Amino acid sequence: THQIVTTQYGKVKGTTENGVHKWKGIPYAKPPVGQWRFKAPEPPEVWEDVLDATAYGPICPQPSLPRQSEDCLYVNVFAPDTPSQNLPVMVWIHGGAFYLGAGSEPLYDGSKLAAQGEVIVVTLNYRLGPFGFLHLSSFDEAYSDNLGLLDQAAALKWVRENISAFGGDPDNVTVFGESAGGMSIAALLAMPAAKGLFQKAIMESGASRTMTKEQAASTAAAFLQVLGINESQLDRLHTVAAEDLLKAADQLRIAEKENIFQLFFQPALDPKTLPEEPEKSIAEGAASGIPLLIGTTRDEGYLFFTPDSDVHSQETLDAALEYLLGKPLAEKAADLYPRSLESQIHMMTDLLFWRPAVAYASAQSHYAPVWMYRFDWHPEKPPYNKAFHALELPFVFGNLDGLITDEVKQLSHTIQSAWITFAKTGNPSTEAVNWPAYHEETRETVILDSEITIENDPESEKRQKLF
Ligand SMILES: [Zn+2]
């Protein structure tokens, strides 16, 4: 029971606390530093001793107490201390607009989920910002685009090859994630690099999201300009200080011509790594047979705009609509968002989260079981009376400190129970809710709140206008 486990690269020793075995800081790839910067993840060098896996590894460098370093490719494992073997495995992919976050953030501690559901929970870090979503393929074929996604895939491959040694079932892996993590999963469900790496998926407030191959190249060129590196000095991309990359990143990202509706960092179309839009691939059966639990919060947009924040600018406003819907649809939908704070908030909720989620769920419904939800809960009294983006996270993980009444603990039990039953069976039904399958004829949706309810074809008027 001292928890020494042999991974394919060497032994690691975790610890046991409050009924949960824990291993933190397990390397799953060679540190992507120096010559390995901007290249696909490689296997880490094997070690012959026993790694004290009781502390989180560094997180990927990002704008800001945890240590940061490009040497950040680590996974963490939480398993229940029970005689039960071959357990379902839930792999978490954190969000953060592709330039923020870490699998080791307190909110994602998997101890409670592991103990309550008797499942294994894996958290991980993947390259972010200029390290993981700066696509340099146009400059050197040796470089890979969508590095952050490749890292996630490598972590999933690590799970497939090593989780049995930790007591998990590599054939019952559920990948789940929120925001950028949900958008990442949208891509992983279709990407060549992630084929066969998981059997179920949960997409929270995030779906198909990509930038064009052309845009990726444009941004890449702008980055090198700021760095003062031309096409005959690419060697310097491997010796330049990480801080210089972070500096260039913030400079370009915060540029006046940049807005929240158009993510500066995000997956990019690329023949080698992500050939086409995830949604399109799914619509053609790329994720056949993979059950999908997907949803959004009712008031997503209120997290990005405050009562006294910037108010539109039809210029950049109409540009957002065309970018998110295409010129033809943008014109037909313009009517829904008359310039105003309210409209920009609704644009965020509807076009960055809701429409993508419904489009993805609809596409997948023709190839696998799909279950859709909308999270409505929030305190009644202002100023926190909105089902803000990410508000369901504390409930999913059972880590409620971020918010604790009995109703809060009750809602967390209801939500976490469904996530657990889904990981185990592919159906999120529990004693508290018989979850109806989502398909295009009825669009039955579960409404998560203190009291569970079901809405058939919710916001149908908005659906007809946006589709
Ligand atoms: Zn032992």
UniProtKB/Swiss-Prot annotation:
Pfam families per UniProt: COesterase
Phosphoserine modifications at: S179
UniProt keyword annotation of Hydrolase present: yes
Domain of life of the native organism: Bacteria
Sorted UniProt keywords: Hydrolase, Phosphoprotein, Serine esterase
Self-association and partners: Monomer.
Family to which the UniProt record says this protein belongs: Belongs to the type-B carboxylesterase/lipase family.
Protein name: Para-nitrobenzyl esterase
Gene that encodes the chain: pnbA
